[PDB]
Amino acid sequence: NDYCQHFVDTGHRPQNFIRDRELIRLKDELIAKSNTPPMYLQADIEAFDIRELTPKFDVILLEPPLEEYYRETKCWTWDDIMKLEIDEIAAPRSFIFLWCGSGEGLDLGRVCLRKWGYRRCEDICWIKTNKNNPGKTKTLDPKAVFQRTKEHCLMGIKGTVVDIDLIITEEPEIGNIEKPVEIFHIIEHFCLGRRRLHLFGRDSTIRPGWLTVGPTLTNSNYNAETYASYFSAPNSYLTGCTEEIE
Amino acid sequence: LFPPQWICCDIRYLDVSILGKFAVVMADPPWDIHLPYGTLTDDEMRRLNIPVLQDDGFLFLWVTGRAMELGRECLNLWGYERVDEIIWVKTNQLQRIIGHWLNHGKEHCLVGVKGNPQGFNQGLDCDVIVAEVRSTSHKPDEIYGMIERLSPGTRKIELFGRPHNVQPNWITLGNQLDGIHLLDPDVVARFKQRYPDGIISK
Ligand SMILES: [Mg+2]
């Protein structure tokens, strides 16, 4: 029945009580085969000319370190984020996935998307269960009306033109900023192209199929000409979900 | 008064100034996202007279599709800051989960603040509702508990509600309600003065 009343009663978030043919999984196999080697580049993204990142990208995953992620433990402001020249490295048809937190980011992240030329097509929520800490209460942002138990990742399309829009995992430990890896599965399952950029990635997010750029990477291997060779003809327009070309 | 109250009307044409001030406003509008009978265009939405209904308190605004952006616009136009955003995860009777890119598992309701609301129990509930789909187009009754716990005993107003939404402490407006049912004496007085024959025209 009333899981909101139940949360008031016991401290168990309503999302603790959500439960759970086909097969797919061949799509994952196709993705895995189609993936370019993992590439990565440590770069201070404030100080970095974004335009050295070529070629233009089919997908961009943008995960700027917001102050709100450091509740109990350089942060970027939405002022800083807005000034990124994201449109200078996006392909004319391309997609963006932006982690917006759960406060003013839900509005300012929309402003960013419009500033860079996308329209929002999906609102993906990461819902945090607290099954292992019903006791731990939440320190509220002054403006908050409710306890904030979720983060939003916004999807954006620019140009001309399966999974659910929810991710449910347990709330990470205090100070752990990692977003759920499932976002990568959602993104890859869209089959949007093979040029995938992850800005503000980390040593721990590097992944095949992706180019990771971020200030805390300890190693770099990115080379714009090596990277461009993975998409030269005849591979220019693979979705990322088809067989390689012999 | 306290028990359910309501007004069948065209919310575009009602003079809501007769209704007084409310601690909580809730609206589940017929956005023109896909034009069914009852839908409002974006300018009509924009020109609703929300700003007279509150001095200090909260607004709850259900949004979907592109009204996620448009409702943010009306919300700000009407004088509110968006300070929270509730999601209702839609489950079946066994608590399993039931936009052309991803299937939708949830519904969104913006929460807006106006003025400095004082005396509210901010932080009792959390921003996720997990509840069971009744009839389609029904909102979950859980939202009324969260609102009552947040602002207990206060005046509330719902816009575009249906007969199943009528609640103690609330005045429900909608065009599929069954006539006018008003108990609060201040409201009954102003309604009589403004509508001496009981019609609601221009
Ligand atoms: Mg997968």
Side-chain angles (χ1 to χ4, degrees), chain A residues 63-66 68-70 75-84 86-92 94-113:
Chain A
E63 193 185 320
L66 309 177
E68 62 186 80
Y69 302 163
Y70 302 103
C75 312
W76 281 55
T77 59
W78 286 103
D79 204 292
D80 302 316
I81 289 150
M82 245 180 297
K83 309 171 146 214
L84 293 170
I86 289 303
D87 59 298
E88 291 298 325
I89 71 183
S94 53
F95 296 77
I96 184 160
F97 297 82
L98 171 70
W99 285 103
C100 289
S102 53
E104 80 186 318
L106 308 189
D107 308 294
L108 295 168
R110 284 173 160 80
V111 173
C112 287
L113 260 53

Side-chain angles (χ1 to χ4, degrees), chain A residues 120 123 143 145 148-149 165, chain B residues 69 81 83-84 105-106 127:
Chain A
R120 186 206 51 78
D123 189 321
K143 297 175 150 176
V145 183
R148 297 188 176 163
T149 62
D165 56 349
Chain B
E69 285 71 46
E81 183 180 17
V83 281
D84 258 321
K106 42 151 176 66
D127 49 15

Side-chain angles (χ1 to χ4, degrees), chain A residues 120-132 134-135:
Chain A
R120 186 206 51 78
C121 46
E122 296 293 352
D123 189 321
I124 303 164
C125 297
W126 174 32
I127 297 191
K128 297 171 228 152
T129 60
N130 69 341
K131 300 182 188 181
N132 318 332

Side-chain angles (χ1 to χ4, degrees), chain B residues 113-126:
Chain B
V113 65
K114 176 176 179 182
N116 270 275
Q118 299 178 53
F120 294 61
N121 311 317
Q122 301 174 77
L124 291 197
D125 281 300
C126 61

Side-chain angles (χ1 to χ4, degrees), chain A residues 24 27-28 31 163 182 184-186 188-189 207:
Chain A
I24 59 166
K27 187 190 286 181
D28 282 315
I31 287 160
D163 285 300
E182 285 102 297
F184 289 103
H185 310 168
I186 291 166
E188 287 150 0
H189 295 152
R207 185 174 166 96

Side-chain angles (χ1 to χ4, degrees), chain A residues 1-18 22 24 27-28 30-32 34-45 47-50 52-66 68-70 75-84 86-92 94-118 120-132 134-135 141-160 163-172 175-177 179-224 226-242:
Chain A
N1 44 3
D2 195 352
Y3 288 113
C4 309
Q5 194 59 267
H6 200 257
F7 167 79
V8 168
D9 287 336
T10 74
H12 279 269
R13 290 164 186 188
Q15 47 263 54
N16 295 3
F17 305 101
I18 302 148
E22 267 179 330
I24 59 166
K27 187 190 286 181
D28 282 315
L30 279 156
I31 287 160
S34 171
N35 284 315
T36 59
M39 227 177 237
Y40 47 92
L41 164 71
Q42 89 93 31
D44 283 87
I45 290 163
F48 193 64
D49 183 27
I50 212 74
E52 306 167 34
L53 294 186
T54 62
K56 307 299 177 80
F57 294 101
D58 313 309
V59 172
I60 294 184
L61 176 60
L62 181 46
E63 193 185 320
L66 309 177
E68 62 186 80
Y69 302 163
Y70 302 103
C75 312
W76 281 55
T77 59
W78 286 103
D79 204 292
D80 302 316
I81 289 150
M82 245 180 297
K83 309 171 146 214
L84 293 170
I86 289 303
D87 59 298
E88 291 298 325
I89 71 183
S94 53
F95 296 77
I96 184 160
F97 297 82
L98 171 70
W99 285 103
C100 289
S102 53
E104 80 186 318
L106 308 189
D107 308 294
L108 295 168
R110 284 173 160 80
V111 173
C112 287
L113 260 53
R114 289 187 296 256
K115 174 183 204 122
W116 304 327
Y118 309 92
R120 186 206 51 78
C121 46
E122 296 293 352
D123 189 321
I124 303 164
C125 297
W126 174 32
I127 297 191
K128 297 171 228 152
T129 60
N130 69 341
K131 300 182 188 181
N132 318 332
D141 161 355
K143 297 175 150 176
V145 183
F146 302 101
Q147 279 195 51
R148 297 188 176 163
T149 62
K150 55 166 176 60
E151 303 185 17
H152 297 247
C153 185
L154 299 169
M155 187 188 165
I157 198 178
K158 80 186 292 184
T160 44
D163 285 300
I164 190 91
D165 56 349
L166 281 191
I167 305 179
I168 313 151
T169 81
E170 179 85 5
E171 181 159 90
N176 182 8
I177 53 145
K179 308 304 178 202
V181 78
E182 285 102 297
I183 194 74
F184 289 103
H185 310 168
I186 291 166
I187 293 163
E188 287 150 0
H189 295 152
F190 279 128
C191 314
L192 308 162
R194 304 178 55 240
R195 297 162 210 81
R196 314 184 184 121
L197 172 68
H198 181 209
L199 285 161
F200 299 102
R202 308 176 295 286
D203 276 4
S204 50
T205 68
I206 282 168
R207 185 174 166 96
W210 285 82
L211 163 61
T212 303
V213 176
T216 63
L217 303 200
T218 67
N219 280 85
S220 303
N221 73 342
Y222 172 71
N223 176 285
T226 312
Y227 187 71
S229 81
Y230 304 141
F231 316 102
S232 70
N235 318 309
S236 311
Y237 317 136
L238 309 158
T239 67
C241 289
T242 70

